[PDB]
């Protein structure tokens, strides 16, 4: 309708493993960590519907603010990766950092922004 | 409407029923069975209802042993699931899975009220709209790692450090100020501790306000599998009809879907990533949210986490982890140093230390004690090495308050009179914040170092120096 | 004495940058074994997974 | 009948390969490593009839010293955390400490007794 | 060859000696033909009763009162695993044991025996004596303590050690390059004649070395020596 939407989601993972679990009662082949075949495809059906309309359409906006949980701190692990692949970026937080007291424990060594630079105004960008 | 044995396969049996009459699921089943002649051998089990086949054939899960089963017996179905008795009348004694007691102190009669086992979660009408804090009287708790009331803490160690000795005044403490009561449940653990423990209790005389059910190593994964769910139903009647505050006990809850990932097996699913069921996270979750506080009452639960191989990525504990809101640490060097009850400081975390939820005041204390303890940690190697010299004027006053602050943490008990002839004491938030600020601020800095050794609250060091002839 | 004092500097100076070195030499030979054991990890979990199902 | 008795078990590893063997040969679902998903209740089973009995029983006692062994030192095996984590304790020895002249190679440091304290005599105690 | 040797010990009492080129391709071929017959694969693969199919044939060799029978055999180790369960369920059914390793041929020693893996039954003070037993525990000791100091060697270099430390490692690299040998096969490719050495002789040169007689000579002379006398006229040859 020509407005501007943001949209947060808690957790992928959870909803990832309660397909696998569904996915394994229906008894349909397994794969990498008893995983579907189409669990890529299942979480870039859902994040590829993000987008800014063009001035035909509406102008309208959306966004999406999508969160993953890690264990022990890796990011190797398989839907972590998936996620790395299709997102623009990615917000790191420190457990150490966060244990010394510092709120929020924001790594700056690793996060990155893609589109970042032309989403800023003159003054930040100077 | 009875049922015939038709397959055994270890703790799995499936059972035949007429056309139209099948039990529903969960529900319980009875066989009883006489000796015919001098081939055969008497039988009594009960099974639970797990899976609905095609013609009309219904798998079950046993309950004990299944020895001796013959193809073709019969089975009597009972049309209600496990019914556990509730009531005053569960108080100091003993029970199993199935609610039976143990000790020889008689049997329950048979018109008291019982309670299916399972059970829907609470609404989200019922719940609690803000976050309140559960009182211990322990300093150390009440300062670095305060408890909320309906939440889960997570307990870590290992043996001889007083683990026992730390929930018998847990216990003591809750029944003394807040009139509540206290439900323990033992799951998959050994034998000579449940012993150990019943005696400890049966000593300290706190056996009166507690109810215990035990279902250990040598049981079958059925039998293991319902423990939680009938010290929950038994401690859920307290919260519901008198609205008091309950503390509940699980000794081990990786048993708890051990024994699940064991059952799956033979039930006919596919293997998981790492082996374990499919179901894991919905089984734990319909325990785990059975356990909040409502307008009427509360229960919190205090449970106790063995990690296998220290291996934090494994999925039982990733999954625990997701429910926990505190932790704490018990540790063999402050246990051998002569502290109780030997918490340790620095490990041990709280998500209710915030600003918001304790007060500035009580924040900046604590962050303050932290900051010391963590400063005068470092310095453990090289005074070690070098000694106590070469220090700067700085360090040398920061381990002089270490050392202060690191005995006044101890306390003693009210159960530990029995040793000792000391009484014990209940220390409030208020006043140990207090002597915690006047301790940093350094009023004491005069006193001698055992002055500050299991006193309580503030003012009893000055008696103790004085006694000591200061 | 000065003569000796100033050759002792450039010595440990000397040692400490060749010990930085060997580390860094021996870092990428770990890292080589480390990639080889992250393979055969999933090489045998994967086809344990699959032998596990096959059996239904 | 109020007399006391020692059993010591030679090796379970080798019980449990035959185990698995036997469950494999009868067609049933493989775990971890070929492994049945019983093995835990087969150890327990056996480790539990150990105890001592009150004086209402006689008196009588049981003790049982099981016998474990490992591959290159490696203590994170399937086999040796599931038979670690049912005993009150553990005895270790180490090639190394062997090779340098300390035999017995009991290493001190690492052994644990869970019930030790109350197993022994004032004069030791002391 | 089992069948053909077991009559001779059993019919006439003589002693028989036995050879076996290589055991492990026996269950690998077992490995290999059980897959065909419907049985559920094993950890790695193997067929599910490899433990009993070799019991059954090493049962079948023993000495009895009738005769005695002494066998070698030769043993593979795929890649290089020493962990794969082929090699891992034969130890318990041997008595004394040698183990090559890859890293000691590389290096230019022969036969590349790796000195504190191999172990055997015979090794008591009242079987082969005590001198012998304290010189064997003795070098095993220093070899050891040698062992434990390659990380900071390899790190911080020889400087840093002690007094004992540099002559430990001085003594150990002397010990083990005199444990190297030149065979008898070899001259065809050397043209050296080779040496037979006795355990008396070996023994008194080992006693030798670690009471510290040679520690002027460089360790160059200790390589493929045979006895101990050699090991002067080899350095006396060389220039020292």
Same mark, same amino acid.
């Given at each position: 309708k020509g407005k501007h939407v943001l949209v947060v989601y808690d957790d992928l993972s959870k909803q990832a493993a309660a397909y696998r679990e569904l996915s394994l009662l229906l008894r349909r082949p397994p794969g990498r960590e008893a995983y579907p075949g189409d669990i890529f495809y299942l979480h870039s059906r859902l994040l590829e519907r993000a987008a800014k309309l063009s001035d035909a359409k509406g102008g309208g906006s959306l966004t999406a603010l999508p969160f993953v949980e890690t264990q022990a701190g890796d990011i190797s692990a398989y839907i972590p990766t998936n996620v790395i692949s299709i997102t623009d970026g990615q917000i790191f937080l420190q457990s150490d950092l966060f244990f010394s007291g510092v709120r929020p424990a924001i790594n700056a060594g690793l996060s990155v922004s893609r589109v970042g630079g032309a989403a800023q105004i003159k003054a930040m960008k100077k | 409407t009875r049922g015939r044995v038709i397959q055994v396969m270890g703790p799995v049996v499936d059972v035949k029923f007429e056309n139209g009459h099948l039990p529903a699921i969960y529900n319980a089943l009875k066989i009883q069975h006489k000796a015919r002649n001098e081939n055969e051998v008497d039988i009594d089990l009960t099974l639970e209802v797990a899976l609905h086949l095609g013609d009309d054939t219904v798998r079950t899960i046993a309950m004990a042993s299944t020895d001796g089963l013959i193809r073709g017996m019969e089975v009597i179905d009972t049309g209600a699931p496990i019914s556990v008795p509730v009531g005053e009348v569960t108080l100091g004694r003993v029970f199993n899975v199935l609610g039976e007691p143990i000790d020889l102190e008689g049997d329950i009669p048979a018109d008291a009220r019982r309670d299916p086992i399972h059970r829907p979660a609470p609404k989200f009408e019922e719940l609690a709209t803000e976050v309140e804090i559960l009182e211990t009287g322990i300093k150390v708790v009440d300062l670095l790692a305060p408890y909320i009331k309906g939440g889960k803490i997570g307990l870590f160690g290992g043996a001889g450090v007083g683990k026992t000795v730390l929930?018998?005044?847990?216990?003591? @403490?809750?029944?003394?100020? &807040?009139?509540?009561? +206290?439900?323990?449940?033992?799951?998959?653990?050994?034998?000579?501790? %449940?012993?150990?423990?019943? &005696?400890?209790?049966?000593?300290? %005389?706190?056996?009166?306000? !507690?109810?215990?059910?035990?279902?250990?190593? @040598?049981?079958?994964?059925? #039998?293991?599998?319902?423990?939680?769910?009938?010290?929950? !139903?038994?401690?859920?009647?307290?919260?519901?009809?008198? $609205?008091?505050?309950? =503390? =509940?006990?699980?000794?081990?809850?990786?048993?708890?879907?051990?024994?699940?990932?064991?059952?799956? #097996?033979?039930?006919?699913?596919?293997?998981?990533?790492? %082996?374990?069921?499919?179901?894991?996270?919905?089984?734990? $979750?319909?325990?785990?949210?059975?356990?909040?506080?409502?307008?009427?009452?509360?229960? !919190?639960?205090?449970?106790?986490?063995?990690?296998?191989?220290?291996?934090?990525?494994?999925?039982?504990? #990733?999954?625990?982890? +997701? &429910?926990?809101?505190? !932790?704490? @640490? =018990?540790?063999?060097? =402050?246990?051998?140093?002569?502290?109780?009850?030997?918490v340790d400081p620095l490990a041990s975390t709280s998500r209710a230390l915030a600003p918001e939820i304790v007060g500035e005041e009580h924040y900046q204390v604590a962050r303050k004690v932290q900051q010391t303890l963590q400063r005068y940690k470092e310095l453990q190697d090289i005074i070690a090495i070098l000694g106590m010299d070469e220090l700067s004027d700085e360090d040398k006053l920061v381990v002089h308050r270490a050392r202060r602050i690191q005995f006044f943490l101890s306390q003693n008990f009210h159960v530990a009179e029995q040793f000792t002839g000391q009484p014990g004491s209940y220390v409030p938030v208020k006043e140990t914040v207090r002597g915690f600020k006047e301790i940093l601020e350094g009023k004491y800095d005069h006193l001698p170092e055992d002055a500050f050794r299991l006193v309580g609250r503030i003012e009893e060091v000055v008696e103790k120096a004085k006694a000591m002839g200061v | 004495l000065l003569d000796a004092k100033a050759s002792e500097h450039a010595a440990r100076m000397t040692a400490m940058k060749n010990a930085t070195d060997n580390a860094n030499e021996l870092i990428r030979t770990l890292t080589l074994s480390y990639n080889r054991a992250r393979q055969a990890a999933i090489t045998q979990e994967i086809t344990e997974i699959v032998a596990g199902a096959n059996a239904l």
């Amino acid at each position: 309708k020509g407005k501007h939407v943001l949209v947060v989601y808690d957790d992928l993972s959870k909803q990832a493993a309660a397909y696998r679990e569904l996915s394994l009662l229906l008894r349909r082949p397994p794969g990498r960590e008893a995983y579907p075949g189409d669990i890529f495809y299942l979480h870039s059906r859902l994040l590829e519907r993000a987008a800014k309309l063009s001035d035909a359409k509406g102008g309208g906006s959306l966004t999406a603010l999508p969160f993953v949980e890690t264990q022990a701190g890796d990011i190797s692990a398989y839907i972590p990766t998936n996620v790395i692949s299709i997102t623009d970026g990615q917000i790191f937080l420190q457990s150490d950092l966060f244990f010394s007291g510092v709120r929020p424990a924001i790594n700056a060594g690793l996060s990155v922004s893609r589109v970042g630079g032309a989403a800023q105004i003159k003054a930040m960008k100077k | 409407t009875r049922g015939r044995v038709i397959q055994v396969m270890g703790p799995v049996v499936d059972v035949k029923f007429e056309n139209g009459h099948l039990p529903a699921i969960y529900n319980a089943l009875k066989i009883q069975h006489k000796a015919r002649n001098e081939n055969e051998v008497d039988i009594d089990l009960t099974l639970e209802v797990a899976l609905h086949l095609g013609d009309d054939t219904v798998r079950t899960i046993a309950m004990a042993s299944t020895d001796g089963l013959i193809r073709g017996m019969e089975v009597i179905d009972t049309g209600a699931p496990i019914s556990v008795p509730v009531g005053e009348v569960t108080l100091g004694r003993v029970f199993n899975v199935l609610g039976e007691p143990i000790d020889l102190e008689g049997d329950i009669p048979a018109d008291a009220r019982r309670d299916p086992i399972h059970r829907p979660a609470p609404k989200f009408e019922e719940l609690a709209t803000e976050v309140e804090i559960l009182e211990t009287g322990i300093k150390v708790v009440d300062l670095l790692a305060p408890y909320i009331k309906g939440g889960k803490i997570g307990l870590f160690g290992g043996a001889g450090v007083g683990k026992t000795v730390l929930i018998q005044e847990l216990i003591h @403490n809750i029944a003394q100020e &807040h009139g509540g009561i +206290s439900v323990f449940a033992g799951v998959g653990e050994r034998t000579r501790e %449940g012993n150990d423990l019943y &005696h400890e209790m049966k000593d300290s %005389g706190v056996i009166s306000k !507690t109810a215990m059910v035990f279902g250990q190593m @040598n049981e079958p994964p059925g #039998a293991r599998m319902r423990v939680a769910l009938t010290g929950l !139903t038994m401690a859920e009647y307290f919260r519901d009809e008198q $609205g008091q505050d309950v =503390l =509940l006990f699980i000794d081990n809850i990786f048993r708890f879907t051990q024994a699940g990932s064991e059952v799956s #097996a033979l039930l006919g699913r596919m293997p998981s990533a790492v %082996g374990y069921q499919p179901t894991l996270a919905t089984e734990m $979750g319909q325990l785990q949210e059975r356990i909040t506080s409502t307008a009427k009452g509360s229960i !919190t639960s205090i449970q106790a986490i063995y990690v296998p191989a220290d291996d934090y990525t494994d999925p039982a504990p #990733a999954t625990t982890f +997701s &429910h926990l809101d505190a !932790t704490t @640490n =018990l540790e063999r060097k =402050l246990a051998e140093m002569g502290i109780y009850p030997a918490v340790d400081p620095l490990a041990s975390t709280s998500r209710a230390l915030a600003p918001e939820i304790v007060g500035e005041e009580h924040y900046q204390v604590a962050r303050k004690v932290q900051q010391t303890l963590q400063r005068y940690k470092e310095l453990q190697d090289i005074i070690a090495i070098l000694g106590m010299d070469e220090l700067s004027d700085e360090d040398k006053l920061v381990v002089h308050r270490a050392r202060r602050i690191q005995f006044f943490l101890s306390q003693n008990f009210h159960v530990a009179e029995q040793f000792t002839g000391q009484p014990g004491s209940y220390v409030p938030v208020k006043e140990t914040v207090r002597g915690f600020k006047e301790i940093l601020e350094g009023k004491y800095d005069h006193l001698p170092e055992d002055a500050f050794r299991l006193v309580g609250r503030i003012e009893e060091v000055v008696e103790k120096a004085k006694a000591m002839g200061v | 004495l000065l003569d000796a004092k100033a050759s002792e500097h450039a010595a440990r100076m000397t040692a400490m940058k060749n010990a930085t070195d060997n580390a860094n030499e021996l870092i990428r030979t770990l890292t080589l074994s480390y990639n080889r054991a992250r393979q055969a990890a999933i090489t045998q979990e994967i086809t344990e997974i699959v032998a596990g199902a096959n059996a239904l």
